[PDB]
Amino acid sequence: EDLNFRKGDAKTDVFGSDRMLQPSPVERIPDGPTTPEVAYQMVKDETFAQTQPRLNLATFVTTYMDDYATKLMNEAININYIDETEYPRIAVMNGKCINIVANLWNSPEKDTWKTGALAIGSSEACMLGGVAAWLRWRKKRQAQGKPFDKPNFVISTGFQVVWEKFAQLWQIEMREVPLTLEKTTLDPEEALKMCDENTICVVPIQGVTWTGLNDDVEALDKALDAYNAKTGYDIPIHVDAASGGFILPFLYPDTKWDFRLKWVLSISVSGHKFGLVYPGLGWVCWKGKEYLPEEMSFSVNYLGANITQVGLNFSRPAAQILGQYYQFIRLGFQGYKEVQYNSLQIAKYIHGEIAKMAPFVNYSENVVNPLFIWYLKPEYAKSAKWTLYDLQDKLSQHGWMVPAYTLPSKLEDYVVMRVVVRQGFSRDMADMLLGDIKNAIAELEKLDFPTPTRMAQE
């Protein structure tokens, strides 16, 4: 007999121990240690009772990479990117990713080492673009003898929350252009009506999270050129291309949205969305070195490479740089094109099957990013006992997360549902989702009384 079996010795079974009769620590660090197997289970087991990543259809962020990328990134788990003197090959590799992304967006910059920065996501990449737009505007207004204490920026009401963070954390006024059924993306005319001498940039979005659509950057650029010629305000574009920045170059090469446009001075993207890398990657590029203020930035030479030093974070994992560069080499342009082709084709397939179901109507007939939204047919909704929130709950019973929500300004009465198709979500998985949607519809149509969310609508 083993005296200390329950206390945690070499013979203890994890689930025959005193520790696994005790709660996990909520407030205070435990006084003493446990065995690695026990602590492993205590943390691991708490992650079971939630959505499985591959069935999270709310997220845009990568939930699958192949086994070689995964092994490569796991092996770099202890590499701190910012130690560039210690890890100069990764610093160079980061710069090469920046070059490749800038050239994917048709940068006219002549320098071999393109002007850009690594980010943890589009959040940091967006904030860097906006701070740069803010600093360029401050300098221009100062040289003109004009005030520079009340900056603002203009964006669709379909903005993603990081722009609200930017507005709050830097105390910059956000001006929002509302969505309507007639103007389902940012209308250039209405955005310009909200511009003045204090506007630091307009932010069109490629891959609006609420709708899956693309603001027309080319139409914005054309309108802005006329407006800037008339006012002299010299207002630029920063493209929030979080999703579309890794869709448009491969599937829509002739759509002019990027550094080909006169007024697009910076672009940001989520490398961990359709850049196909696990969580923790974003990129921001500037059209040239003259658009990244010296106040924000400096550059260091590593093994002949000019790597710009700009960022909100400092120490950070380096694994995502290896993952991105691996994808660029493993897939190339052709491979990126076929993977995004698959994701868009599957999104289009689900869109078409949803349109055939009696309760549903799609927000758009045009699927340009691998995601889309739909709502209840207005005539169907009036007499239905259920809402899209009830459908979300039914789908959750089978492990899916398919989110229902209200649309932004002036469409807020529309409850919609969104499906995002990422690499690793196949046609076969689409059929499973659609089968569960049909069954969920059949069960909810048997209801004799309205649900809580249905009553709230009336």
Q: Which residues are annotated as a binding site?
A: 122-123, 270, 272, 315
| 100 lies in the site for a copy of itself, by CB under 8 A | yes
Of the listed pieces 89-97, 206-214, 219-227, 370-378, which binds a copy of itself according to CB under 8 A? 89-97
Of the listed pieces 203-211, 228-236, 374-382, 443-451, which binds a copy of itself according to CB under 8 A? 443-451
DSSP class per residue in 176-189: EEPP-SS--S--HH
| 174 lies in the site for a copy of itself, by CB under 8 A | no
Q: Which residues of 159-195 are buried (b: 16+ CB within 10 A; e: fewer)?
A: bbebbeebbeeeebeebbbbbeeeebbbbbeebbeeb
379 binds, among ligand PLP, a copy of itself, none (CB under 5 to 8 A by kind): none
| 362 lies in the site for a copy of itself, by CB under 8 A | no
Task: Give the shortest CB-120-to-ligand PLP separation in angstroms.
Answer: 7
Q: Quick one: 226 or 312, whose CB is closer to ligand PLP?
A: 312
Using CB under 8 A as the binding rule, the residues of this chain from 263 to 292 that contact a copy of itself are 270, 272-273, 278-280
Q: In this structure, are residues 118 and 101 in contact, taking their beta carbons and an 8 Å threshold? A: no
| Site map (CB under 8 A) of a copy of itself, residues 41-70, x = contact | xxxxxxxxxxxxxxxx-xx-xxxxxxxxxx
Q: Quick one: 104 or 162, whose CB is closer to ligand PLP?
A: 162
d(CA 287, CA 225): 17
Q: Known binding site for pyridoxal 5'-phosphate: residues?
A: 122-123, 270, 272, 315
Task: Give the shortest CB-97-to-a copy of itself separation in angstroms.
Answer: 10
DSSP class per residue in 345-372: HHHHHHHHHHHHSTTEEES-S---SSEE
Phi, psi of 24 (to 5 degrees): -75, 155
The residues facing 240 across adjacent strands are 205, 268
2 binds, among ligand PLP, a copy of itself, none (CB under 5 to 8 A by kind): a copy of itself
103 binds, among ligand PLP, a copy of itself, none (CB under 5 to 8 A by kind): a copy of itself
- Three-state DSSP at 216 gives coil
Six token digits for residue 36: 């690695």
Using CB under 8 A as the binding rule, the residues of this chain from 287 to 326 that contact a copy of itself are 295-296, 303-304, 311-318, 322, 325-326
43 binds, among a copy of itself, ligand PLP, none (CB under 5 to 8 A by kind): a copy of itself
Six token digits for residue 171: 């105390």
The residue count for the chain = 458
26 binds, among a copy of itself, ligand PLP, none (CB under 5 to 8 A by kind): a copy of itself
Q: Quick one: 255 or 273, whose CB is closer to a copy of itself?
A: 273
Strands 264-270 and 305-309: unpaired
| 366 lies in the site for a copy of itself, by CB under 8 A | no
Q: Quick one: 60 or 153, whose CB is closer to ligand PLP?
A: 60
User: First and final CA of the chain: distance in angstroms?
Assistant: 68
193 binds, among a copy of itself, ligand PLP, none (CB under 5 to 8 A by kind): none
Phi, psi of 176 (to 5 degrees): -110, 130
Task: Give the shortest CB-103-to-a copy of itself separation in angstroms.
Answer: 5
Strands 282-286 and 264-270: antiparallel
| 401 lies in the site for a copy of itself, by CB under 8 A | yes
The residues facing 418 across adjacent strands are 373
Of the listed pieces 183-191, 217-225, 253-261, 333-341, which binds a copy of itself according to CB under 8 A? 333-341
439 binds, among ligand PLP, a copy of itself, none (CB under 5 to 8 A by kind): a copy of itself
Vertex 236, ends 232 and 238: CA angle to 5°?
170
360 binds, among ligand PLP, a copy of itself, none (CB under 5 to 8 A by kind): none
Spell out the residues 6+ positions from residue 241 whose beta carbon is closer than 8 angstroms to its own: 205, 206, 207, 248, 257, 258, 267, 268, 269
Task: Give the shortest CB-225-to-a copy of itself separation in angstroms.
Answer: 29
d(CA 220, CA 65): 35
User: Which residues of the chain form contacts with ligand PLP (CB under 6 A)?
Assistant: 60, 121-123, 126, 160, 162, 205, 207, 209, 240, 242-243, 270, 273, 282, 314-315
d(CA 289, CA 111): 9
